Design a protein around this nucleic acid. Sequence first.
DNA 1: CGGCAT
DNA 2: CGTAT
DNA 3: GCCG
Length: 330
Amino acid sequence: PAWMPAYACQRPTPLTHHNTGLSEALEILAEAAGFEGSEGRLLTFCRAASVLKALPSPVTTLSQLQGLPHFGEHSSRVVQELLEHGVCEEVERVRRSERYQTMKLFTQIFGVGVKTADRWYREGLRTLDDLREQPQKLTQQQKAGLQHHQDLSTPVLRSDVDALQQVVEEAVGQALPGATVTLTGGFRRGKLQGHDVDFLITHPKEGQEAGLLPRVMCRLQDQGLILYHQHAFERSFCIFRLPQPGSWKAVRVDLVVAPVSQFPFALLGWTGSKLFQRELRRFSRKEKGLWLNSHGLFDPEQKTFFQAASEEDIFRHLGLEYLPPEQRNA
DNA sequence: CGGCAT
DNA sequence: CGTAT
DNA sequence: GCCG
Ligand SMILES: [Cl-]
Ligand SMILES: [Mg+2]
Ligand SMILES: [Mg+2]
Ligand code: NA
């Protein structure tokens, strides 16, 4: 064989695709590689999983892997075992291991990453109750993640997104007339559920947005909508108290402010997927010699920033065919 | 051999 | 270290 | 783990 470019940003990856079983197995090995501190192996297994999501048809025979980027001996053997037996011994040993299950449990807590989870694992901790019994080990961010863990493990749905966008738009409009709110993240790519809601805030007049996020946060906090926040800043990783009929649930919400000159770059970065953006930035630097992030696209020879009005402008400047958000699900 | 996004 | 995609 |  199939047509397959080597970078995920060069090919469409739709929301609904084939080979979910094969990709899920490779993503288990990627996660486990991360848990052992091998970010390179994580990245290869993620890239190989992503290739399968971009294929036109189900992989049913090993020969369909011929020539595909990021498939070598190890990834091919995993697929071969799945095709020949319906299960991969390595994947089953990993996913049934105490180490994997505990690291997954701990790293899923807001405020805990691999290095913290591994330190706790090496100290003999295994359950969330173990962490509660030792609160001296916890940052304030981790305490919030642990307190609200049950709600934060519940998928966020589109009905939640619509309610949250309304309250964020109200606070933003009270904080700065003319400011706008754009849904980004997975929901902009067409996902039906998520672990959080991501919003990008700007104003059409450059500079007006300076100092906006503390004003938005204060207005949300005064409506009783904020369970946790990190506190001059431009990103806020919040836990909202989202009203529900007769009750409420905690929801993770990310808010990001950008000046309008940077909006297309911030929109592109925060729409994702994570792998899509890593691959796009790798492409930009390695193939074009340009440095990309959510603030801009920098030419380090001329020492200039590319002025973009749209995501389409950024793709075109990089020599890439434009992909809409729903084809960025790498 | 070292990179692997910013 | 953690967080965003 | 794969590849530039
Ligand atoms: Cl979905
Ligand atoms: Mg999200
Ligand atoms: Mg987010
Ligand atoms: Na975490």
